[PDB]
Amino acid sequence: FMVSLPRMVYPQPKVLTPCRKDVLVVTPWLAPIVWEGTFNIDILNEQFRLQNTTIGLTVFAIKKYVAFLKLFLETAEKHFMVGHRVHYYVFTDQPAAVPRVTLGTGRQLSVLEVRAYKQDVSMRRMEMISCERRFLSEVDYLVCVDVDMEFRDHVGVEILTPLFGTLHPSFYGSSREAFTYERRPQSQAYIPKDEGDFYYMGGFFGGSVQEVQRLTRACHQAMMVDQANGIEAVWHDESHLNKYLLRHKPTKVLSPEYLWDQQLLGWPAVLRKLRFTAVPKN
Amino acid sequence: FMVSLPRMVYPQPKVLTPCRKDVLVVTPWLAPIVWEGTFNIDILNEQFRLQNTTIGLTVFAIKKYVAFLKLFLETAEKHFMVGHRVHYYVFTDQPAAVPRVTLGTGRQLSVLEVRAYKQDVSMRRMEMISCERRFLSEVDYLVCVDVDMEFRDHVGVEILTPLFGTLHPSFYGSSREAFTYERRPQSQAYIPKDEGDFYYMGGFFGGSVQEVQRLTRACHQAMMVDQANGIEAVWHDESHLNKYLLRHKPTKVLSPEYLWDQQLLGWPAVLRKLRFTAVPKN
Numbered sequence A, B: 001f002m003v004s005l006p007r008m009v010y011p012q013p014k015v016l017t018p019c020r021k022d023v024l025v026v027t028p029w030l031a032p033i034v035w036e037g038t039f040n041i042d043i044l045n046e047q048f049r050l051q052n053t054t055i056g057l058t059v060f061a062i063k064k065y066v067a068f069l070k071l072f073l074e075t076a077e078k079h080f081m082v083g084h085r086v087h088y089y090v091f092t093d094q095p096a097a098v099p100r101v102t103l104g105t106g107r108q109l110s111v112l113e114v115r116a117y118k119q120d121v122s123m124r125r126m127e128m129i130s131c132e133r134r135f136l137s138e139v140d141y142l143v144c145v146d147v148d149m150e151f152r153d154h155v156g157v158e159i160l161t162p163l164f165g166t167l168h169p170s171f172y173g174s175s176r177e178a179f180t181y182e183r184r185p186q187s188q189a190y191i192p193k194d195e196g197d198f199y200y201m202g203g204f205f206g207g208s209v210q211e212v213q214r215l216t217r218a219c220h221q222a223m224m225v226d227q228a229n230g231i232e233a234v235w236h237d238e239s240h241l242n243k244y245l246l247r248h249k250p251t252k253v254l255s256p257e258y259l260w261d262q263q264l265l266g267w268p269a270v271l272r273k274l275r276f277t278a279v280p281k282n
Ligand SMILES: O=c1ccn([C@@H]2O[C@H](COP(=O)(O)OP(=O)(O)O)[C@@H](O)[C@H]2O)c(=O)[nH]1
Pocket: A059, A060, A061, A062, A063, A064, A065, A121, A122, A145, A146, A147, A148, A203
């Protein structure tokens, strides 16, 4: 049950003025595409706080990638769901290498030890995410991200929805035939040249716990099939995520504001904010 | 559980071209505003058929308004949720005056006899809608409309969502201070001049059965309070609907395509289609 919003004073939305005219702000299946200027964060904050929403954030830091956790977590503290309940889940082969990061109130961190693999590290995240009962008991939404990243600006409840993917920053202006989907029919991830909505980035997806369990289960089952058949998708888990989201349309799509690489792509005018960005690495 | 969509061939959405640049297509709380050009109905049809969705449509035809049912129902047959399961619920004081209208397969009609009131006819719909157990057993969504209307074009599953309202065709270009909300603080429907997103039309709202029961319960309770206090809102149930939807934001908003009056307002260029329209009356 959702109680009433309180009185709020904010600018009237005007139907005969769009804020954003430069970009597509809704998918053809009526999912919002989240850009700056499309949301009033005060209204969304009220809505989600009235539900006491808890957001879980998963991150893998295996082998040398433990080095990325300090900046990841410190900047998450500045920018990620501030004001909301947050539970970080750090999956690592080196529990003792997890930095001691000071958290704001209502935020917690759990360290989950996993085995290190010798592509497989990236690909095994789906299996490892699909800690199932734990998440259902502890959080409302799961957000699943790469560790070699930093938050530079607001990443908040505007992302939350049953199922979301993020537009890959190298492909948002590309035609579908250019997308690097898996193109071999022998793979479970196969997508023909005349199919596809978007090319989603494997490093930032999420949703409700139920929908995230569904996705990671389906992608892990599809990768197992490929394994059995002696085929490895061109972009590993990302290929499978793309096949899933083609057949199960996300209920929001995040703009490239939410997964950017300023060294490789600069700062185009279409991006008002650079919210979550790649950290330079070998 | 939602099974996979089948392969489909359709135009790629392009992120750096919006279809609609002339109008706001998403609210500041990230609800789509449904205009022609914003949706691919093939994708939406697939999604909703995979769920075997059943849509209930409520209409009141009391006293002389029974005359409007033939055209209402015949045009609903041509345009309303065609291909989906539909259950019409016709609330009337004259069961024998309900015309015999031939229905397509998978569609049914029930006649529910009510008492006629001597404003009260309009206002009592909320109470009468909130047949509660019946709807929960028989339909997935409820759509609640005025009878003095005709379908002229497609009205389909693009509307379905947990909770929707429709932009009133006289006010979609107006500033909020011009909206005819109830302005007396003594009414439960009161909305101050600096509040309000939109002015929703009382003649077309809906949602999931749960959310529609919530709305009609809340509006009926608020009208009872007003009654007890000797105040009748300026626009009756519509005033209360507007207060509800201010405090409980709809998950889609329908454009004025979905409730138009061509005699009073013509056919502006911003309306690509006129889908559900007023029938001329005294
Ligand atoms: O040795 C490794 C390789 C990968 N990863 C995790 O897998 C994610 C995906 O790998 P990576 O970021 O290297 O892919 P890229 O973004 O360079 O294509 C990383 O962010 C880490 O979260 C890891 O923890 N250790």
